[PDB]
Amino acid sequence: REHWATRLGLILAMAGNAVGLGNFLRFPVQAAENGGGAFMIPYIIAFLLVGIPLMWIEWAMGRYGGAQGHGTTPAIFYLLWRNRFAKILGVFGLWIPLVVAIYYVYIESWTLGFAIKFLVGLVPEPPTDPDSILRPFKEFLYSYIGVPKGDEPILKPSLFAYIVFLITMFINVSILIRGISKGIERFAKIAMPTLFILAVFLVIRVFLLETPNGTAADGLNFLWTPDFEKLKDPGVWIAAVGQIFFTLSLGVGAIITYASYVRKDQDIVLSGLTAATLNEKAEVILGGSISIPAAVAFFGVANAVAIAKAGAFNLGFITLPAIFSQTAGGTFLGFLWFFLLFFAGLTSSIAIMQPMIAFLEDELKLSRKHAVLWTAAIVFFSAHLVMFLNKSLDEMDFWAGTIGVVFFGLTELIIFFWIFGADKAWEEINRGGIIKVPRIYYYVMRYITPAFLAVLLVVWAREYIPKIMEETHWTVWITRFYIIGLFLFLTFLVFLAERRRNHE
């Protein structure tokens, strides 16, 4: 079986998986919509009681399975619990990263697309007023994506947006087809430093920003001013736990597969803890010091609220681009911005596709070349539903990316720490550990963490699913139909995998 060459590589790869567009976009927005500085209370609490606990578990499971030639949950779940229902539940852990990938690479292709357009200075040029500046860029984005102009839920991406998507896929293939060490690990060692560098620069530059409407200091101030009255709101503790789950890429299956290439006795406690720490610093320190400070510096705190409610997407692809077109060398700044995000996405998309690759290699005995190519094929084809059908992206992101990950996280906890055996799991976690997990996490993982994930799934599902299932256009069934098919497909492959094992 393949393995990570170095300890630095492993950590950087794992960290690259967790660091994404969310670090520089979603976090700042959430933190602002949930009490600024006060949001650090439920955020930190969730990181210690959910993020870290679950993270180690996925490392543990991943490594556990890797020692037996299995890097995916259909087999790993079976190993932790020899029951056919464990194989079916394991399929769900392979379905999620596949579906997510189907829409994520495309999203990533956007950043590469914009980075290019900005680099070469092919962008809108206002003109005065905010609406006047924003509209040109709002339309710049809409033209790229192909936002519907009619009542038909049809998207029509630009030829350029399509071609860039092909290139993005090609870049992912190039890295993946070289394997774990010479491909993923190798690229991580370059991407992370480049990422960190680009972030730092952007941080410095933003702090210099001064307009009649305000400064970067105003933005940071607003963002970090604690509103201790919002902590009462349960919806805040839900946004916090959700933000941690998101930023750590938990329940997505990526971590398990990466961890399956960790040697039988190679530490996962310190390695995992460090990987997480890296992501956190990139999120709060860097991510919180760019987008929002910039938006507030340019539009004044008078719109800090509105802009925050406008969403992370608008913030990263519309508002900031517009801000850049009004600052000195802003166009080359936009480049660095989207360049930053592209590497943020890339280090995740390669991780989000490895699971499907690992399955083909481990269970169907496909060469790495064939596995990667077929995986690229499946995702590339499937992506066309996301590119051309409006709101398909949202549907996949919901069931798989959102619902799926929280449900699966709870499943992991229970199978590992309850079915498999708490003590067995605990030793399975601490074994080979450079450092040992504080004896207190035993109870956290066994009761506290599952309890949390349950409340999150439940309290949140009550005020979520009803909408999607009722207040949506009928075309959502196209997407639901397709992704359900993918689940069937994967269930079939698993069937074929277990039949092959019996034959040999």
Quick one: which of 354, 240, 214 has its CA closest to 293? 214
- Kindly identify the residues of this chain, within the stretch 362-381, that bind ligand BOG according to CB under 6 A: 381
Q: Which of 1, 7, 156, 391 binds ligand BOG (CB under 6 A)?
A: 156
Alpha-carbon distance 286 to 340, whole Å?
A: 12
Site string for ligand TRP, 229-248 (x = CB under 6 A): -------------x--xxx-
Q: Which is closer to ligand BOG, CB of 105 or CB of 238?
A: 105
| Contact predicate 16/254, CB 8 Å | no
Residues of span 311-350 touching ligand TRP by CB under 6 A: 348
Q: CA 204 to CA 201: how far, in whole Å? A: 5
Q: At what angle do helices 449-462 and 405-414 cross, to 10 degrees?
A: 150
**Per CB under 6 A, which of residues 122..141 are in contact with ligand BOG?**
122
Looking at residue 365, its amino acid is K
Of the candidate spans 33-41, 71-79, 213-221, 264-272, the one that interacts with ligand TRP by CB under 6 A turns out to be: 264-272
> How many CB atoms are located within 10 Å of the residue 264 CB?
13
Selection from ligand BOG, Na ion, ligand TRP, none that 16 binds (CB < 5 to 8 A by kind) is: Na ion
The site that binds Na ion (CB under 5 A) totals a number of residues, namely 10
Query: Contact with Na ion (CB under 5 A): which of 9, 11, 20, 260?
Result: 20
Any contact of residue 288 with ligand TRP (CB under 6 A)?
Answer: no
Contact 209, 292 (CB under 8 A): no
**Least distance from C-beta 216 to ligand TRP, angstroms?**
23
**Which one among 265, 423, 427, 463 touches ligand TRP, defined by CB under 6 A?**
265
From candidates 6, 69, 120, 485, binder to ligand BOG by CB under 6 A: 120
The Cα–Cα gap between 18 and 292 comes to 21
How far is the C-alpha of 186 from the C-alpha of 308, rounded, in Å? 37
Does position 400 interact with ligand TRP (CB under 6 A)? The reply is no
Those residues with Cβ within 8 angstroms of residue 166's Cβ, 6 or more apart along the chain or in another chain? none
Q: Per CB under 6 A, does 440 bind ligand BOG?
A: no
Question: In the range 249-308, which residues lie near ligand BOG by CB under 6 A?
Answer: none
In whole angstroms, give the CA distance from residue 371 to residue 10.
Answer: 22
- Identify the residue whose tokens are 């490594």: 63
321 cis-preceded (ω within 30 degrees of 0) = no
User: What helix, strand, coil percent values describe the chain, rounded to 5?
Assistant: 75, 0, 20
**The one segment of 19-27, 43-51, 151-159, 258-266 that binds Na ion by CB under 5 A:** 19-27
Does the footprint of ligand BOG cover residue 433 (CB under 6 A)? no
| Candidate list 163, 197, 377, 488; residue touching ligand BOG; CB under 6 A | 163
In the list ligand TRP, Na ion, ligand BOG, none, the entry touching 267 (Cβ below 5 to 8 angstroms by class) is ligand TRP
Pick 14 or 107: Cβ nearer ligand BOG: 107
Helix (H, G, I), strand (E, B) or coil at 154: strand
Q: How far is CA 163 from the centre of its chain?
A: 24
Alpha-carbon Rg for the chain, nearest whole angstrom, is: 22
Contact status: 461 vs ligand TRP (CB under 6 A): no
Chosen residue from 40, 44, 136, 160 binding ligand BOG by CB under 6 A: 160
The continuous run of DSSP H or E covering 210 comes out as strand 210-211
Q: Which of 157, 272, 293, 330 binds ligand BOG (CB under 6 A)?
A: 157
Does residue 212 have a cis peptide bond before it, meaning omega lies within 30 degrees of 0?
A: no
User: In the numeric block, which tokens belong to residue 6?
Assistant: 């170095």
From the list Na ion, ligand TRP, ligand BOG, none, which binds 116 (C-beta under 5 to 8 Å, kind-based)? ligand BOG
Work out whether 74 is an interface residue with ligand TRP (CB under 6 A): no
Picked from ligand BOG, Na ion, ligand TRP, none, the partner binding residue 266 (CB below 5 to 8 A depending on kind) is ligand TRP
User: Is 84 annotated among the ligand-binding residues?
Assistant: yes
Q: After which residues is the chain broken (C to N over 2.5 A)?
A: 127
| 407 touches ligand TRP (CB under 6 A) | no
C-alpha to C-alpha distances, 139 to 135, 148, 305, 332, nearest whole angstrom: 6, 12, 23, 20
Contact (Cβ atoms closer than 8 angstroms) between residue 4 and residue 10? yes
Span of 57-65, 79-87, 114-122, 278-286 interacting with ligand BOG by CB under 6 A: 114-122
5, 67, 88, 116: residue in contact with ligand BOG (rule CB under 6 A): 116
Residue ranges of the binding site for phosphocholine:
84
Residues forming contacts to ligand BOG in the complex (CB under 6 A) are 116, 120, 122, 146, 156-160, 162-163, 381, 384
Residues forming contacts to Na ion in the complex (CB under 5 A) are 16, 18-20, 23, 247, 279, 344, 347-348
